[PDB]
Structure 1
C-alpha cells in the first residue's frame, strides 16, 4: 500500500487537501493517509512551524501532499522559519512545475511542458549582505548541484513522449556561474543518449514561451530563473491558480499547489481545488501509478470543460461541488 502524508497547512489548504484526498480515494488505489500539520497556525500552537511529529510522518511515507502556508508579509516573527531546517533535512532539490493546456478562458492550446529548477536549501543558503549603502546577494552554482538537477530533469525528459530537454542559461553574460551549470548538465546528458538536448539563452526562451510555447517539452534552469519562466508559462494557462507543483529528492517528495494560503477567501468554501488535485495526480505519477494519474487528470479536464465553475473561473459554485463532480467523472474513466 502507498503511504501518503497529508499536510493542509493554512487557509485554503483546509479545503483543497481534503478535496484532493477524496479524488485520490476515488481512484480505488491501495492508499494509506497519514495526517500531519505545518504552517503559520501550527507555529502559533507548538512554537514551531514544523513539529518533530510532522518530520517523522513525512519520512515514513512514500510521498507527501501539502496545501499552502501563510507567509508573514507584514513582519518576520521569532524564527517562524523553522521550515528552512526541514528543507535541509529533506533536501528535495528538484522543483518541478508542469505547464499544460486546460479547457479554461485565456488558455493557449497545445502546451505540455515541464520546468525544472533546483532548491538549494538541502545544500546551502545563498546569502545576502548589506554593507552601508551597498547590498550584495550571492547567486551560487556548484558542480554537484548542477549534476543532480540536470540528471533529474533528464529523467523527467526520458519518461515523456518527446524526449526533449532545453537547458536555459545565461552563460553569455555569466561565463563562470551559468557556464558551469551549462557544461555540467551537458556532461550528464551523455548518460541519456535517448534524450534530445538543446541549449538556449534564457532570454530567447522567454520570448519563445510567449510566441510558441508548444516547442518545449522539459526545460532545465537555475533558480530565480525557473520561477520567472514558470510565471510567464502560467500566464498562458490562465494564471497561477491552476498550477500544480512538486519538490523532489532522492528518497521522497512533496507535492503542492503553487497558490498561497489565500486567507481572504478561507473558510468560505469556494477556493478551486484543481491545483491540489493536479498536484496529487503528479504524486501518483511519481509513485508509479502513471495510468491512474492520467485518469485523474482527464477527470479534472472533463470538469473544467463540463462544469461547474468556481469564482476564480467565472462562476459561483462551491469547492465541495467541484470535488464530487471530479470524483464522479473519475468513476467514468
Structure 2
C-alpha cells in the first residue's frame, strides 16, 4: 500500500483536496490517507504555517498532495508561506510544471511540454541587504544544485517520447552564474545518450513558447527563470486554474495545484478540482503507478471535453458533480 499525506490548506483547498482523494480512491489502488495542516488558516490558529507535526507526517508518507496556500496581502510578523518553507525544509529541489493542451475554451492544441525549474537557489536564496538607498540580492548558482536539477530534467525527458531537453538560460549576460548552470547541465547530460539537448537563451525561449510551443518537450532552467516560463506556458493551455505541479526531492515529494486559495469562491462548492486531480496523477506517476496516472489524466480529459463543466470553464457543474463525472469515467477504464 501507498501512504498519501493530504493537506487541504486554505480556501478552496478544502474543496479540491477531497475531490482528488475521491478520484484517487476510484483508481482501485491500495491507498492509505493521512491528514495534515499547513497555510494561513493554520497560521491564524498556531502562529506557524507549517507545524512540526506536518513535517513529520509528510516524511512518514510516500507522497504528499497539498491544496492551496493563501497569499498574504499585508506582511505578517511570523508568517512564512508554507510551500516556500517545505521546499527548503524537505529539500524539494525540482519544481515540475507540465503544460499540456486540454479540451477547454481558449487553450492552444498541440502543446505538450514539461518545465523543470531549480527550486533551491538562484534569486531564491533570499539573501537581500539594503544599505542607504541601494538594495542588493545574492543570485546564487552552484555546480551541485545544477547537477541535481540537470539529472532530474534529463530523467524526465528520457521517459518522454520525443527524448528532447532545452536548457533555458542567460549565460551571455551572466557567464559566471548562468554559464555554470548551462555547462553543468551539458556535462551531466552525457550519461543520457538517448536525449537531444539544445540550449536556448531564456528571453528567446519565452518568445518561442508563445509562437511555437509545439517545439518543446522538456525545458530545464533556474529558479526565477522557470517561475516565469511555467506561468507563461500555463496561459497557453487554460491558465493557473488547470495547472498541476510537483515539488520533488530525493526522499519525498509534494504535489499541488498552482491556483491559490481563491478566497471569494471558497465555501461555495463550485471550485474546479482539475488542477488538484492532475497533481494527484503526477503523484501516482512519481510513485511508479504509470497506468493509473495515465488513467486519471484520461478521465479528467473526458470530463473536460464532454461531461459536466464548472463555471470557470463554461458550465455550472458543482465540484461534486465534476468530481462524480471524473470518478465515473475513471472506473470505466
What is the CA–CA distance in structure 1 between the aligned matches of 2:269 and 2:299, rounded to whole Å? 21
Query: Does the Cα contact within 8 Å between 1:93 and 1:248 map onto a contact in 2?
Result: yes
Cα distance change on mapping 1:241 and 1:161 into 2, 3 Å: same
Find the residue that maps to 1:16 and give its secondary structure: helix
Cα distance change on mapping 1:83 and 1:316 into 2, 3 Å: closer
Q: 1:65 to 1:135 in 2, by over 3 A?
A: same
Please report the RMSD computed on the Cα atoms of aligned residues, expressed in angstroms.
1.6
In structure 2, distance between residues paired with 1:85 and 1:321: 34
Cα distance change on mapping 1:190 and 1:121 into 2, 3 Å: closer
- Partner of 2:86 in structure 1? 86
Where 1:263 maps in the other structure, the secondary structure is coil
Q: Is the 8 A contact 1:87 1:122 kept in 2?
A: no
1:121-171 CA distance string (max 9 Å, x none): 699833122212111222111111111000110011111111110000111
Deviations 1:181-223 (A, max 9, x none): 0000001000111111111111221111111111111000011
Distance 1:3 1:227, change over 3 A: same
1:29 match: secondary structure: coil
1:123/1:3 CA distance change after superposition, 3 Å: farther
SS at match of 1:230: helix
Contact persistence 1:126–1:140 (CA under 8 A)? no
Structure 1's unaligned 5+ residue stretches are none
What is residue 295 of structure 1 aligned with on the other side? Answer: 295
Shift of 1:25: 0.2
Q: Matched residues in 2 for 1:32 and 1:180: separation?
A: 43
Q: Quick check: 2:95–2:116 contact (8 Å CA) kept in 1?
A: yes
TM-score (norm 1): 0.96
Aligned equivalents of 1:61, 1:295: Cα separation in 2: 23
In the alignment, is the contact (CA less than 8 A) between 1:5 and 1:65 conserved in 2?
A: yes
Distance of 1:306 and 1:156 partners within structure 2: 31
Task: Measure the CA separation in 1 of the matches of 2:45 and 2:206.
Answer: 43
Point out the more displaced range, 79-88 or 244-253. 79-88
Q: 1:86 to 1:292 in 2, by over 3 A?
A: closer
Q: Does structure 2 retain, via aligned residues, the 8 Å contact 1:255–1:280?
A: yes
Indicate the SS of the match to 2:8.
strand
Q: Distance in 2 between matches of 1:298 and 1:110?
A: 16
Counterpart Cα distance in 1 of 2:121 and 2:271: 30
C-alpha distance after superposition, 1:105-131 (max 9, x if no partner): 111111110001111169983312221
Of 20-29 and 189-198, the range deviating more from structure 2 = 189-198
Distance 2:110 2:82 in 1: 41
Q: Give the whole-Å Cα distance in 2 for the aligned partners of 1:82 and 1:65.
A: 13
Range with greater deviation from structure 2 (247-256 or 200-209): 200-209
Change (3 A) 1:81 1:319: closer
Which shows bigger deviation, 217-226 or 123-132? 123-132
| Residue 238 of structure 1, CA deviation | 2.1
Structure-2 residue corresponding to 1:51: 51
Contact 1:49–1:83 at 8 Å: present in 2 too? no
Distance 1:182 1:169 in 2: 7
SS in 2 for 1:227: helix
Check the 8 A contact 1:91/1:121 in 2, yes or no.
Answer: no
Residue 69 of structure 1 corresponds to which residue in structure 2?
69
| Superposed CA offset, 1:278-299 (max 9, x none) | 0000000100000110000110
Q: CA deviation at 1:82?
A: 7.0
Contact 1:6–1:65 at 8 Å: present in 2 too? yes
Contact 2:102 2:301 in 1 (8 A): yes
The alignment covers a number of residue pairs equal to 333
After TM superposition, the structure 1 stretch with the greater mean CA deviation from structure 2, 134-143 or 276-285, is 134-143
Range with greater deviation from structure 2 (308-317 or 172-181): 308-317
